[PDB]
Paper text:
Here, we describe and detail the use of sub-particle [name] averaging and present updated reconstructions of [name], a multi-subunit tetrahedrally symmetric protein complex. Originally described by Liu and Gonen et al. (2018), [name] was computationally designed as a scaffold capable of displaying small proteins for [name]. DARPins are small, ~17 kDa helical repeat proteins that feature variable residue loops capable of selective non-covalent binding to other proteins, akin to antibodies. Variants of [name] and similar scaffolds have since been generated and used to bind and image small proteins, such as GFP and KRAS.
In addition to focusing on the DARPin components, we also set out to extract as much high-resolution information as possible from the stable core cage component, this time by masking out the dynamic parts of the complex. To push for the highest resolution possible given the dataset, we created a mask that excluded the flexible DARPin components while keeping the core cage of [name] intact. Multiple rounds of 3D classifications and refinements using tetrahedral symmetry were made until no improvements to the map were observed. A final set of 277,091 particles were postprocessed using multiple rounds of Bayesian polishing and CTF refinement to obtain a final map of the core cage at 2.7 Å. At this resolution, we could model nearly every side chain of the complex. The map also shows possible sites of ions (mainly in the 3-fold trimeric interfaces) and water molecules (not modeled). At this point the resolution of the core cage is likely reaching the limits inherent to the sample and data collection parameters.
Residue numbers in the entry:
A (entry chain C), E (entry chain S): 23 to 99, 103 to 163
B (entry chain E), C (entry chain U), D (entry chain M), H (entry chain W), I (entry chain V): 2 to 119
F (entry chain T), L (entry chain D): 23 to 163
G (entry chain R), K (entry chain B): 23 to 100, 103 to 163
J (entry chain H): 2 to 55, 57 to 119
M (entry chain Q), N (entry chain I), O (entry chain A): 23 to 100, 102 to 163
The structure:
C-alpha cells in the first residue's frame, strides 16, 4: 500500500498495544472504557487500511468520548507526567495517541480520508490526559 | 470564535435558546482552543423558511462556527462534531418528520482580522 | 445547501417570500446537484440598512448560497446565475432607482462538516 | 461589498444604527476600493446571545465585510482597521465590562458571483 | 494563441458543426432553438479566442437556457442513448458539449476567463439531454 | 474528481452515444448486440467513475465479445486494406470503432495512473476488433 | 509507440472514418476527391506511425489540394452557421475533425521533427472541406 | 510467443491436448499480435502435484504465455482472458471439487532475445 | 501462488516428492500471504542435466515460486528462505559433493493475470 | 545461472542432449560471468506441442535465468552465444526450418535463496 | 551516517530495549529465546550501521525463527484485543515496535540495496512475537 | 505550525512520559534527578514550540548533566557490550535512552532546518549518555 | 545528431583508428582478423549514426567473434600480468581499453534510444578477443 | 575552473601530445606543419583556460589551414578505405579522431560560455587536414 | 556498478595500458619505475571498483612518487617546449595526458562518493613525474 497508510496503521496498532498494556493498571470502569477504545481503534485501522472503502467509526463514538471528557473534566481542577505508575502509563498512551494523530493527519492531507478518525484521536488524547489526572487525584 | 445558530419557527427545543447557547459555549470551551471570553454565541429564529420542494412540514437547525485560521482539520472536525452533538441533544422535535441538524466550521482570515476592546 | 435571502424593508416583490423561496428551491433542485430534502432556504428582511453614501432611497436583494466543496466553477456559476435570474424575476421594485440583485455561491468545507438527523 | 453589523441587545451606541451605517459606508468609500452605490450595509440586533461561560453580563459588536477577490492583504487589513475604528468610536458602553468589537473581512469569489440590476 | 485556447476553440467548432448536423432531424421550434444555440457558441468562440478582450454571451442567454430546461423538465418524467435516430443525434451533441465544457474549464482554470461560457455549456448539455428524452417520448 | 477519470467517462459516454446512433442502421441481431455493448459500456462507466469501488464488467462479457469476434472472423476474408465506409452502415461502425479506440486510450491512461480498468481496456480492445469485423461483414453483405 | 504518435494516428483514423461516412452524401466527383483524400491520409498515417521511416505523401498531393481550393474559391462567395444542408453539415464535421487531427500532427511535429508536410496537407484539407461545404450550400 | 500449459494428472479434459493446443493457438492468432508460425505451444502433464494443505483431492490447470515486451496492459489482459476462456471451456472435471484455471502473461525482454531459423 | 520444484535424477531425498510438496505447501501457508486452496505445487524430475564443466557428476535442487505482485522484498525474501530451508532439510544427498539448493521468488503481474474456477 | 532447453519430440539433433548441454555450459562459462559449478543446465523433450495454426514443424527454445545486475550488452551476448550453440546442434525436423530462440531473463538477487547441503 | 541508516539503527535499538524490558515477564525458555533475538538484532544493527561492510545474520537464524513459528503455531488457535494479560501486552508492544523497525529497514533496503535478510528476520520476529503473546494468553 | 516542530515536541513529550514512568522504579536520588530532567525537557519543549522566541535551558543544566555523567563513569566498568535490560529497572532506563535518541534526531532535524535548539540537542545527547550510565549503575548495584 | 550518438560515433572512430594502427605489428592472420573487425565497426558506426534506420552487423559476426574467442582460449593459460608484456601486445591492450570505452558509449546510446544492443554485445566480445590476442602474442 | 573548461583543456593537451608523437613518422614539411599546429593548439588552450580573457588564434591561422586543405585535396582522389593503410597514416588517423573529440569538448564549452567558436572552426579544419594528410601518406 | 565508477576504472585501465606501451621505449630504471606505477594503478583500480571496501595504495607510494619527483626536478631546467621532442618523451607525454584524464574521473568519483582522495593525489603526482621523465628523456 501507500507509505503514509502503512505508517498510520502501524502507529495505530502500537497505540492499541500500549492501551492494552495500560488497561491492566486501572479499575473496572476504566478498563472497560479502554477496551471500547481499543475496539474503536481497530475500526479506525480497518477504515484507514481499506483507504476508506470500509466504513469506520460513527459520530456516536466521538459523542461518547466527549461525554466522558466532560464527566472527567468536572472532576479535574501543572504537574510532571507520571505522578503515579498508573497515570504514567496513560501519559505514555496519550503521547502515542498524539503520534498516531499526526500520522492520521498526514493520511488525511494526502488522501482526503480519516477526518473523523483524527477527531477521535484528538478527543482520545484529551480523555487520556484527563484519566491520568483523575488517577493522580484519586 | 463566533457561533450563529439558526432554527426554524416550527422547531421545538428541549431547553430555551439561553440554555442552548450556554451548552454550546461550554462545549466550545471544553475543546481548549479558545479563551473564555472570546466565545460569542447567538441564536436566530427564522420565520420565512422552506426546506426542499415537497409539501411536507419540516424543521431544521443549522449552526455556523467561525474560527480564526491556523487550526488543523482534526480540531475543526472535533469542534463541528461537538457542536452537532449538543444541538441534536437540544432538539425535541418539529415538523412532520425528522429534524436535520448541521454544523459548519469555517475559518476566518487571521491576518486581516481586526479586534478591539472598548 | 443553505440559501439565505436578504431583502431591504422598502423592497417590493411580485410574490410573497414563501413563493420566492419555493421558486428558489425549485431552481436549485433543477440543477441536479442536491438532494430534495437537503435544500434549506430562508428569507430575512433588513430593517436597518443603507446603500452607498448618497441621499437616495434604494433597495437591494442579496442571496448567499452555501454548498459543500468539490464542485466545479461551471456548476457554481450556473447555480449563481439561476438564483439571480429567479430573484430578479421576483423583484417588483423599491427605492427611487433600480434594485440591485446579487447572489454569492460559497463553498463549505465538506471534510469538517457535521450533520445529524433527529 | 456587503457589510453586516451584529450588536447585542444590551449594547448602547453613541449614535443610532442609521448614523453608524452612514459612518461605516463613508469609511468604506474613503478607501477608493468600491463604487459608491455598490456599498450595501445592514445592521442586525441580537436578542438571544451569550458570551463565554462566566455569569457576567457582556456586550459585543461584530461586523463582517464581504468583498470580491483580487485585493491584497494590505487592502483587506486597512479595510478591517477602518471598520473597527469606526465601530469602536460608535460604542458608548454595555454590559458589566468592556465591549469587544471585532471586524472580519471575508473574500467573495468573483468568478461565480452573480449580479443584476432590475 | 495558446494551446488550451486553440483546443477549446476547436472543440467548440466541433460542437457547432454537430449541432448543425443534428438540427436537420428535429422540428421547426427545436431547429430554431439549435440555431440560437449555434449563434451563442459563436459568441463564446469569439470571446475565448480573443482571450477575454471581446465580450461574450450575456446572462440572459443562460436565463433563456434555464427557461427551456424548466419547460422541458415539465414534460420529462434510465434508458440507453439513442431510442430514435433524432434523439441519438442530440445525445452525440450532448457528449460533445460535455467535451467542450471540459476544454473551456481548462481554459478557465489557466486564464481566469470563460466561467459564464462553462455555465452555458453545462446548461446546454442538460438541455440537450432533455430534448433527446422529449423526442424519445414524442 | 480526477481529470483522467472525467476524461475517460466523457469519452465512454461519447462512445455509447455513437453506438446508439449507429444501431439504427443495422439489423435486429446486430442491434441487440450493440444494445448489450451499450449496457456493458455503462457498467464500465460506473466502475471507472467509482474509481474501482463499484464492480464493473465480468469476464464472461469479454468471453462473449471474443466468441462474436471468432464467429464474424469466420465470415470475413480480406486481401488488402480498404477505405472505411464502403456503405453508410459500415461507415457508422467505422466511426464507432475509432471512438472506441479513443476511449481505450483514455481508459489506458486511467489504468496507468490508478491501477484500475485493465478488464475495461481489454473489453474496449475486443470491442474495436468486433466493430471492425461488423463493418466488414456489412460491406460483404 | 509514443503517446503523441498513437494519439495522432487515432485522430487520423477518426478523420478517415468520418470522411468515409460523409462521402455517401456527395456526388461522384466529390466522392472520388474524398476517396483520394482517404488514400492520402493512409500515407500520412503510415508515415507518422513509422516515426518517419516510411515515406509519406508527396508535394504533388498538396499541389492537387491547392488546385482544388482555388477552383472552388472561383465559385464561392466568401460568416454563416454550419450545416445549411445535411450534406454540408457532414463536411463541416469532417472539417472540424481535420482541424483536430492537424493539432495532433502539429504536436507530433513539435516533439519529433516529422510530419510538417502532413500538417500542411491537413490544413489545406480543412480549407478544401470548408469550401466544399459552402459549394454544397450554394448548389 | 511461447505458451506452456500445465495440467495435473487427475484433470479430465473435454478433448485431447492436441486439440486443446489447436484451440489455444487459434485464440492467440485471432488477436492479431503474433505471426502465424511464431506461436509455439506445448502441453505438460504433472505427475507429482499438491494443491493446498487439505486432504481433499484437487485438480488445476495453469498456462503461462510469454510474449516479447512492448505491448500494453490492454493487449496483455485480453490475451490472458482469451487463453483462460479457451482453457476453461476444455475442462471436463477432475478432483472432488471445482478446477482452478489460471493464465499468466509475462513479457520477455526484446533486446536480449535471440532468434534464428536453422 | 505456483511452486515448481526441479530435482536431478541422481538426487536422493529423505522423503517422497509428495511429502516434500506437502511440507513446502505447509511452509508457504505458514506465511499467511496466501489462501489455502490457492497454493499449487508441482515436482519435476530432470533426466538430462549438466552442472558446470568439470567431469564430476553432481546433483542440485531448484525451486521457483511465482506470486502475484504487490508484496515487499521482506515478504519475498522470507518466502524464499522458508522454501530453501524446507528443501535443504529434504535433501539426503547425491553426487560426490554437496548438493546446491536454490529458490527463486518471482512476481506475476496482477493486472493481466486471469483466473477461473470450473 | 539456470538453463532450460526445450525441444520438440520430432526435432533431430546432431549430438546427444548431454553433449548439447556440455556445449551450452562451455559457452556460458566462456563468458566469464559465472562460476564453474554455478552453471546448471537441463534438457526437456516436448511430447505434446503445436506450432502455429497450419505442416509439421519443430522448434528449439532455451531460457537462461541469471541474477540481476548485468548490463544489456552482457545479456545480449549470452543470448547470442546460446543461440549459436543451439543452432549448430540442430540437424533438422518437420518439413520446414527449425526456429531456435533463446530468452534471457533476470532473477531478483535480493530475494534469491541459495544453500549447499 | 545517512538519515535512514541512523533512523533504522535507532529503531532497532528501541526494539532491543523493549525486548529486554519484556523478557523479565516470561519464563526461562521464552527469556532465552528473547536473549537470542536480542543478539540477532545487535548483529543486524552492526551490519546496517556498517552500511553492509560487516556481515550480518545468517540464514540459519531465520530458519530458527521459522521453526519456532511453526512450533508455536501448532498450539495456537488462530480475534482478540491486544494485552489479554500484562505479559502478552508487553510482547504485543514489542511486536508493534518490530513492525516499525521493519518499516525503517525496508526504507534502508529500498534506498541502498542492503538488509533484505534483516527485513525478513524482522517480519518473522513480528510473527513470532504475535504467536508468543497468544501462547501466553492461552496459558 | 511546522511539521518538524510538531514532531520534535511530540517526541519530547513521549520522552517525558517514559521518564515519568521509569522514575517509579529507581531510588530517591535517581528519582529526583529524573524529575529535574523532566523539568529541563519541559523547558526545552517551550523553547522548541516557541521556535526560539521563548528562552530554553541554560548552560548550567548541561554542566549538571556532565557532572552526573563523570560521577557515574567513576562507578561504571564495562569490558564488552551487554544486552539491554539485565534488570527491569535498567530496562526501563534503556527504553528511556532509546526514546531520548529519537527525540535527539527530531531536534536535530529542527535545528538543521531552523537554526535553533543546538543546546537542546547537546542536552539530549548528554541525557542519553547519562541514561546509559544509570542503567549500567542499576545493573551493577 | 544527438550528443550520445555523436560521442558513440567518435569513440568508435577512435577504436577503428587505433585498431588500424595496431594491425601493423601483428602477423597476417591477425591482421586480416583486425581488418574484418574494422569493417564490422564501420557497419556499427553506420547503424548508430542512422539511429537504426540502416541495418548494422548480423549475428554471424558475433558468432565469428565467439568462435575466435573459443579458439584463442584453447591456447591461453594464465596468473595476473601487467598490460604490455611486449609492444605488440601493448597495442592490443590499448585497443581493448578503447573498445571498453566505445562499449560504454554504445551502452549509453542503447539506454537512451533502444538501439545498438547487438553492437554492444559485439564490442564486449571484441574486448574479450583483444585481451585473448594480447595474451597469445605474449605467450608466442 | 569549470568542469567543461578543464575537460576541453585536457583533451587539447592530449591532442597536442598525440600530434607530437605522430610528427616523428612524417617528413620535414609535415613535421613543420604539425609543429605549427601544436603552437596553434597551445594558443587555443591558453584562450580557453583564460575563459576568453586571453586572445587566442587569429583568422589567418584558419586561412593557412584552409590553404593546406585545398592544396592536399588537389592531390587526393578517393573509394572507401580503412584507417591505417600504413603506420604513419594510422598515426594521423588517431590524431584526427582525437581532434574530433577535442572539437566536441570545445563545442560544449562554446555552447555553455559563448567562447571558442574560432577554436572549434580551427579544430574542424584541423581534422579535415589530418584526414587529407593520412590519405596523402597512403597514396605516397 | 555506478557510471562514474565504471568510467574511472575504464580510464585507469587505459592509463595502465598506455604506460605498458610506453615502457618499451625507456631504459631499465624507468621501465622498473613504470612497472611499479602499473602495480600501484592496479591497487587503485581495485580500491575504486570495490567502492572503498578493499584498501588501495598506502602513503609510502605517494612518498616514493614525491621522492622521484624531487630527484628528477634536480635534473630538469626549463623555457616552454612542445610535447614530443623525441618519440620516447612523446610516449610519456601521452601517458601524462591520460593520467590527467584518469585524475578527472577519480575526482568525479571522489566528489560523488567520498573515496579516492589518495588515489587522486597519486594520479596528480604521477602526472608530474611523467612530465619530469619526458623532459629528462628530451635532455638526455
Amino acid at each position: 500500500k501507500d507509505s503514509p497508510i502503512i505508517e498510520a496503521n502501524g502507529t495505530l496498532d502500537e497505540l492499541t498495544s500500549f492501551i492494552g498494556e495500560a488497561k491492566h493498571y486501572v479499575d473496572e470502569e476504566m478498563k472497560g472504557i479502554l477496551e471500547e477504545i481499543q475496539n474503536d481503534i481497530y475500526k479506525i485501522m480497518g477504515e484507514i487500511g481499506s483507504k476508506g472503502k470500509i466504513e469506520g467509526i460513527s459520530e456516536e463514538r466521538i459523542a461518547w468520548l466527549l461525554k466522558l471528557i466532560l464527566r472527567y473534566m468536572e472532576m479535574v481542577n501543572f504537574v510532571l507526567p507520571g505522578g503515579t505508575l498508573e497515570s504514567a502509563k496513560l501519559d505514555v498512551c496519550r503521547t502515542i495517541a498524539r503520534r498516531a494523530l499526526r500520522k492520521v493527519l498526514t493520511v488525511t492531507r494526502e488522501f482526503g480520508i480519516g477526518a473523523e478518525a483524527a477527531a477521535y484521536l484528538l478527543a482520545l488524547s484529551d480523555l487520556l490526559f484527563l484519566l491520568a489526572r483523575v488517577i493522580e487525584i484519586e | 470564535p463566533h457561533l450563529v445558530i439558526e432554527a426554524t419557527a416550527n422547531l421545538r427545543l428541549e431547553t430555551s435558546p439561553g440554555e442552548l447557547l450556554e451548552q454550546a459555549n461550554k462545549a466550545l470551551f471544553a475543546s481548549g482552543q479558545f479563551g473564555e471570553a472570546d466565545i460569542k454565541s447567538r441564536f436566530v429564529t427564522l420565520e420565512a423558511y422552506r426546506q426542499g420542494t415537497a409539501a411536507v412540514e419540516r424543521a431544521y437547525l443549522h449552526a455556523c462556527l467561525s474560527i480564526l485560521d491556523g487550526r488543523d482539520i482534526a480540531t475543526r472536525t472535533l469542534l463541528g462534531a461537538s457542536l452537532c452533538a449538543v444541538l441534536a441533544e437540544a432538539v425535541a422535535g418539529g415538523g412532520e418528520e425528522g429534524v436535520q441538524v448541521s454544523v459548519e466550521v469555517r475559518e476566518m482570515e487571521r491576518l486581516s482580522y481586526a479586534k478591539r476592546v472598548v
